[PDB]
Amino acid sequence: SREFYEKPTAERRRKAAAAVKRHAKKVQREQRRR
Amino acid sequence: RRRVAAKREVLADPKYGSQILAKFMNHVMESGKKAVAERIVYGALDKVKERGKADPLETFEKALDAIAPLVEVKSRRVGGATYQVPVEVRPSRRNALAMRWLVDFARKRGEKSMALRLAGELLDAAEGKGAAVKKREDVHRMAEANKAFSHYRF
Amino acid sequence: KTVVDGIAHIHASFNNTIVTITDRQGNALSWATSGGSGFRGSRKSTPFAAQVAAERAGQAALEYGLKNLDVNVKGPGPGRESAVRALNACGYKIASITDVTPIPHNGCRPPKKRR
Amino acid sequence: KEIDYKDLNTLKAYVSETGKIVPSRITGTKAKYQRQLATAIKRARYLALLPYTDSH
RNA sequence: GGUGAAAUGCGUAGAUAUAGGAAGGAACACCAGUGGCGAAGGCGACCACCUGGACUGAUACUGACACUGAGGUGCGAAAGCGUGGGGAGCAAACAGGAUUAGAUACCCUGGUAGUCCACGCCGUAAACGAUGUCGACUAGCCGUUGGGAUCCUUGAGAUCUUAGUGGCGCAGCUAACGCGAUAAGUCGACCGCCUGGGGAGUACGGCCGCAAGGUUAAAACUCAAAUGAAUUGACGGGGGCCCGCACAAGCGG
């Protein structure tokens, strides 16, 4: 939640994997879809 | 960890012809000899009904009517405190303590004759005012905090 | 008195669970907390004790009527959804739950992160 | 075309049920029009044509 | 009935608390985006006013007016520092309460400086892309932001073109990792800098500061090394799979 203060260095660490799990989603599944 | 265990009890006799007391010769032949145990093994069957009016099995069949707990207490942990899981199990599981617990707690009485000692509380399985029907309802009582321990974190 | 409908709060913190029954005139009738049922210490900030705490709100509210109730939930802790099923079971045919959890739009800064 | 705080039939299509603006990954909207959407929301929201929170 | 577990504020003063009101600071959820703007530091509500630079399209004009830059001079997170407002929340110091051989701490309950505003100072950061600025060139593919133009055109769109911002990757380079039109390639112009590790960004001097201190900046002496990146192993109070009476069924000191 908003329980503790997130110091804005560790809050400016974003994008867990969203250019992998939503960008390489149509790449790594191309071993079958060709 | 697949279970390759296979259960199959033999239930037939040339003397009693019972179900869960036919193949029981295991704890009544107390590591020694059958000659001395033969009068103690099936000598108590006609000693529990020889003091009452009904047949031996009459009060032997009603042992799983007041000595079988409705829950289980096997522990498990997830990331905090160990929580057990209690729920309606299969008959076999529930009806295992409804004889052997009533049977093994007869050494703290011990009256005349070894066979009477074994038959000491076999006739108690009807009214359930002995010691085997004192821990039956006790099990249920220790499940208020364990009531919601089955799905979430269990 | 006898009031037939009221709005019923659940304060659902990480530590405790407070349930207060009011009317739509907001005035408190019967409050029952998750530590007021003899808990006192460590263990049950759990949906178990709110199941215990929400019913005591019920059978003390069953003095001045209160058939239908409206449930306001406020807080992040367990005992959030196991106090609204512990509430219809006391003979309430509650209309709809409502969530009122206070969210700042930027607000005060929170405390330091626990280490 | 150029969406506007008066046009509430357009603005209500990107307001969620709790009052919040819906992102661009949910509705298919271009990045220029989204940041133009969330200004006409915030003007109609200010001007009491739209709530901030769900409640009232 | 917080949690690796309990201890402070409450009832002849009403206890977390109402469907209520008022005050006051401070931060602007959602939008929010390998998004945007800025020389960097930075900048997130909305509206108005005052203002800077970019991007972009054609056309007209000036005609090398350019690039860089020792000195110098501006602007520089935070915290600190005067001087005066302010003071919710949070909170160095500090008080207790725990936890532990101790605990001077990590956890709890408080809480003044500070954080906030005005003017002035400091002038530093892992101030980082650990990568100076400017210019020209060198395979592609996949996103995205601001424009523009072409495309049968409905755009649900497509293509090329620019200026940014990203993900891969050919050549090439690299000690390797890796970089690869946002070069660490290929070259050019200029500047800053480095010369084994400690001593040491330290003494002494000078300059600056109100201070804290900053900046410029060594030697004696000491040691044969420090150091980078990758490799095999061992190890981890790293993670994921797997096994065995390892975990509890009807044993017994």
**Chain C touched by B78 (CB under 8 Å):** no
- Count CB-CB contacts under 10 A for residue A20: 12
* Interchain CB distance below 8 Å, C47 and B147: no
3-class SS of residue A5: coil
**Closest residue of chain C to A10, computed from CA coordinates:** C113
Interatomic CA distance for residues C77 and C26, integer angstroms: 24
Sheet of strand C97-99: strand arrangement: C28-33, C18-22, C3-11, C65-74, C97-99
Eight-state DSSP code of residue C114: P
**Residue A22 C-beta-side C-alpha neighbours within 13 Å:** 6
CA distances from C52 to B31, B67, B84, C28 (A): 52, 29, 20, 19
Residue C84 sits in a domain of what CATH number? 3.30.420.80
- Count CB-CB contacts under 10 A for residue A5: 13
Nearest nucleotide, CA C43 to C1':
E1
The widest CA-to-CA distance across chain C, in whole angstroms, is: 52
**Closest residue of chain B to C44, computed from CA coordinates:** B145
Give the list of residues 6+ apart from residue A11 with CB closer than 8 angstroms, or none. none
For residue C44, give the nearest of C9, C82, C5 by alpha carbon.
Answer: C82
Identify how the structure was determined: cryo-EM
* Interchain CB distance below 8 Å, C112 and A6: no
Please count the structural domains in chain B: 1
Interatomic CA distance for residues B85 and D29, integer angstroms: 51
DSSP for B32-85 reads S-HHHHHHHHSSSHHHHSSSSSS-GGGGTGGGGGSS--S---B---SSSS---B
Interatomic CA distance for residues B146 and B32, integer angstroms: 44
Eight-state DSSP code of residue B140: H
Strands C18-22 and C28-33: antiparallel
- Long-range contacts of range B111-118, CB-CB < 8 Å, 24 or more positions apart? B114/B40, B115/B39, B115/B40, B115/B43, B115/B44, B115/B47, B116/B44, B116/B47, B118/B28, B118/B40, B118/B44
Residue B13 in any domain: the answer is no
Phi, psi at B32, each rounded to 5°: -165, -85
Strands C3-11 and C18-22: antiparallel
Domain that includes residue B102, residue range? 19-149
Residue with tokens 């939640």: A1
Strands C3-11 and C65-74: parallel
User: By CB neighbour count within 10 A (0-12 exposed, 13-18 middle, 19+ buried), where does C51 fall?
Assistant: buried
Q: How far is the CA of D34 from the C1' of E154 (A)?
A: 24
Are the CB atoms for B16 and B45 separated by under 8 Å? yes
Please count the structural domains in chain C: 1
Give the list of residues 6+ apart from residue B34 with CB closer than 8 angstroms, or none. B25, B41
Domain that includes residue C40, residue range? 1-115
Residue with tokens 């042992």: B63
Output the 3-class SS for B70-133: CCCCECCCCCCCCCCECCCCCHHHHCCCCCHHHHHCCCCCCCCCHHHHHHCCCCCCCCCCCCCC
Output the 3-class SS for D1-56: CCCCCCCHHHHCCCECCCCCECCCCCCCCCHHHHHHHHHHHHHHHHCCCCCCCCCC
Are the CB atoms for C53 and C36 separated by under 8 Å? yes
A-chain residues near C103 (CB < 8 A): 2
For residue B28, give the nearest of B38, B13, B41, B18 by alpha carbon.
Answer: B41
Residue B43 sits in a domain of what CATH number? 1.10.455.10
Closest CA–CA distance from residue C24 to any residue of chain A (Å): 30
Q: Indicate the length of chain B as a whole number.
A: 154
Eight-state DSSP code of residue C52: H
The token pair at C68 is 């239908």
Interatomic CA distance for residues B149 and C36, integer angstroms: 22
Closest CA–CA distance from residue A12 to any residue of chain C (Å): 16
For residue D34, give the nearest of A13, A14, D42 by alpha carbon.
Answer: D42
Burial of C61-98, coded b for 16+ CB within 10 Å and e otherwise, reads: beeeebeebbbbbbbebbbbebbbebbeebebeeeeee
Are the CB atoms for C73 and C10 separated by under 8 Å? yes
Are the CB atoms for B95 and B66 separated by under 8 Å? no
Are the CB atoms for B124 and B130 separated by under 8 Å? yes
Interatomic CA distance for residues B134 and B66, integer angstroms: 9
The token pair at B76 is 């498990």
The token pair at B72 is 């289980």
Radius of gyration (Cα) for chain D, nearest Å?
A: 11
Interatomic CA distance for residues C86 and C74, integer angstroms: 16
3-class SS of residue C20: strand
**Chain A touched by C113 (CB under 8 Å):** yes
List chain D domain ranges.
1-56
Closest CA–CA distance from residue A17 to any residue of chain C (Å): 25
Give the list of residues 6+ apart from residue C3 with CB closer than 8 angstroms, or none. C23, C64, C65, C66
Tell me the residue type at D47. Answer: L
Helix runs in C11-108, H state only: 47-61
Which residues 1-34 in chain A show a CB within 8 A of chain C? 1-6
Strands C3-11 and C97-99: unpaired
CA distances from B73 to B76, B85, B103, B153 (A): 10, 6, 22, 15
Which CATH code is given to the segment(s) D1-56?
A: 4.10.640.10
